[PDB]
Amino acid sequence: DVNKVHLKLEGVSSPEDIKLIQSRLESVEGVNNVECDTAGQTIIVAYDPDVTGPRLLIQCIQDAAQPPKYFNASLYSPPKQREAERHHEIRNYRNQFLWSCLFSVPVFMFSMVLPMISPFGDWLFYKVCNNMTIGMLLRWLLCSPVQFIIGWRFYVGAYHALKRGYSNMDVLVALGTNAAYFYSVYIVLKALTSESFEGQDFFETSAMLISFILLGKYLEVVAKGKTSDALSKLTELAPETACLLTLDKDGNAISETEISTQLLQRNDVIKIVPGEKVPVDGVVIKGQSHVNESMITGEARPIAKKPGDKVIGGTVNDNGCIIVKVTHVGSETALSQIVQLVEAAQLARAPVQKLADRISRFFVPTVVVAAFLTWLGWFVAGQFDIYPREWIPKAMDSFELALQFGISVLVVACPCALGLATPTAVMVATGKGASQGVLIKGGNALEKAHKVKAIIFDKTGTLTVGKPSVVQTKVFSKIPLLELCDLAAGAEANSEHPLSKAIVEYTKKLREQYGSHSDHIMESKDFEVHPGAGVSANVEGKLVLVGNKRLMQEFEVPISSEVEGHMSETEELARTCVLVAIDRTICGALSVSDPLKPEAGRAISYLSSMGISSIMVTGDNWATAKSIAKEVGIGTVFAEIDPVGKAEKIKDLQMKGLTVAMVGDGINDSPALAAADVGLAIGAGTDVAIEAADIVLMRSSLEDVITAIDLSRKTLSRIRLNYVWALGYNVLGMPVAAGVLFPFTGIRLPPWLAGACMAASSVSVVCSSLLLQL
Ligand SMILES: [Mg+2]
């Protein structure tokens, strides 16, 4: 913005308006450079960042607004265009595969079914000049579009492997169509020239290979996962407008209008009405209010801000309008750092080299050498005349038979199920995971999650807490349990702290635990709110004392044994983990804190059983992090870690190998969630964490992590087996294609049971969805 702006005119289609805008901009001094892109109806304005402001430029643009349109100038790009791009890709691949089927299925049918079928089987035998048949010509004409027109991708892939020294899936593995087609053309031409030549064409294999490879590409695009990602959520987290605050106070006149935050500059002021999301980072001039800092800290404790403190863009205040002088804006904001980390992580994942490409790299030389060896062997055997002469078919020589047995190896040795292996395991894995409640967006997660050795958990909503709540209550004030809850609710009647509200819901839970919520309470008078001490309030004229020993002494309440037993670590000194909550008399207290685990302990134990270690990287107090690490069992723990520090930890672990996986809950985790090998998000968390991860967990459960890892392990199994079965019949029929059978048996090669092993291979590439991981 302040550095360079792409002012795209809206509703402008004539160069005269652009020229008027150019003249108006040149009439204003301060812009370093004006790039005049006449073609495109857009203009680039570059100038020194952190001076003046785009508001003057926008006003100058708006001064030229004339009918029939309104001349708006701001950077227009099509947002969430990757969804439409994914639809375009899906339509393109589906229609191309459908066209390949429309040309291949007739070839296969006319080749294999009609010859055996009832009277319409001699229609594709009616001879032409010499021994050219109607069937051969029709198969040629139908298959020719498939080999060439739809094969442009394959030929350009082969030409892209010109001298680079590699054999991808678009090399002879898929170009065996090129050999089969040319051999079939040779057969047809010779039948046109020869007089008996009882032979058959191989047009089936080319069309079938093209169809299966296009199906593999289509299914790969389908199983690639949900449409990339969406960094737009990070920007949506920032406010779109801000209240300009040149209002009354000394050198500030009246302003209250809402101006775009992107248009705000340094040395500006925003007040943020209570209950508003702060636009940009700043330093407060005056004002006391609590903010829900979660972009950096990640927790939900209301941080109190007094005059002279700072503020982080994205949070919401609740205790009044807090005027703030604007600090660093734009690319220097903390949210900007988070965003930049996100796209740096996104444009750093090199796509995994498909095992199909590796095989084809180490399979084409094998096939070519094998075919050449068969050709040489039969050529030698014919030139030295070992095998009987009558073995050769009519009108053929030894060299022709050698060529036949050589090209047979090339035709049979065609993967034709290699591209169908990974897609038709990833799809089934994703479906079964969605059934189990583990939605896995992207197959890349499927292949990279099996080798995960380290996992990194987060604390403020990932492993421990859904929302703060009370645990481990004991009788206090030497009063009945129901009337304990009576005191609790009576004290809560005037306090509205988030911990106090959690006490309200937990008291309601106790009430319904005693059969049902018994009636209601009396109002608490004298809501003094003693600083430091806590809530002191006359409940029906009786003073409840939710607060520490100072509040005990201000009402002259004694001290007892447990008073020094239940805080610090979590349950060591000050009688309640995060609060005090004694009420009027002393007999005990409660244990308001964050929840511990619904299952997390056994999940971590099972993860350690499989060898995957766990590391905790939180952004909370050291004491709580140590407490949780001791409780659940995580050894390594890091506290007060910003998202940048999380990314650095991921980078260090990755540099030590041991492909990592982060389980995230909120804004704090997103940089590491994108920077890890695979991202895990808790469904109960916020939208940005759901978006930034690769394996979102539908139901909030740590056991979903082990389900995902187990699913990835079982899909890395049943995929090497899929590759084995895809190599399978082809590599086992390579000897049959070569000819080692004709010396022993009488059959040379069944024309139908030569290409009709790819169907068996395709059926053998089938996966069952029975996980049962417990
Ligand atoms: Mg958290």
Short mmCIF file of C-alpha atoms and ligand atoms in Angstrom, two decimals, residues 297-299 458-463 465 617-619 646 664-669, ligand 1:
data_model
loop_
_atom_site.label_atom_id
_atom_site.label_comp_id
_atom_site.label_asym_id
_atom_site.label_seq_id
_atom_site.Cartn_x
_atom_site.Cartn_y
_atom_site.Cartn_z
CA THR A 297 -0.27 -15.74 23.70
CA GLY A 298 -3.02 -18.07 22.49
CA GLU A 299 -4.82 -18.20 25.84
CA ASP A 458 -0.05 -27.11 21.89
CA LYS A 459 -1.74 -26.47 25.39
CA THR A 460 -4.37 -23.73 25.40
CA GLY A 461 -7.05 -25.70 23.57
CA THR A 462 -5.21 -28.66 22.08
CA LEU A 463 -4.38 -31.19 24.81
CA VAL A 465 -8.65 -27.23 27.84
CA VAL A 617 5.40 -25.93 22.64
CA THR A 618 2.90 -23.61 24.34
CA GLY A 619 2.56 -19.87 24.75
CA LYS A 646 7.06 -22.35 16.98
CA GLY A 664 -2.93 -27.15 16.45
CA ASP A 665 -5.95 -25.34 17.88
CA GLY A 666 -5.75 -21.65 17.05
CA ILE A 667 -4.00 -18.63 15.56
CA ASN A 668 -0.84 -19.34 17.58
CA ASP A 669 -0.23 -22.65 15.83
MG MG B 1 -3.51 -23.41 22.04
#
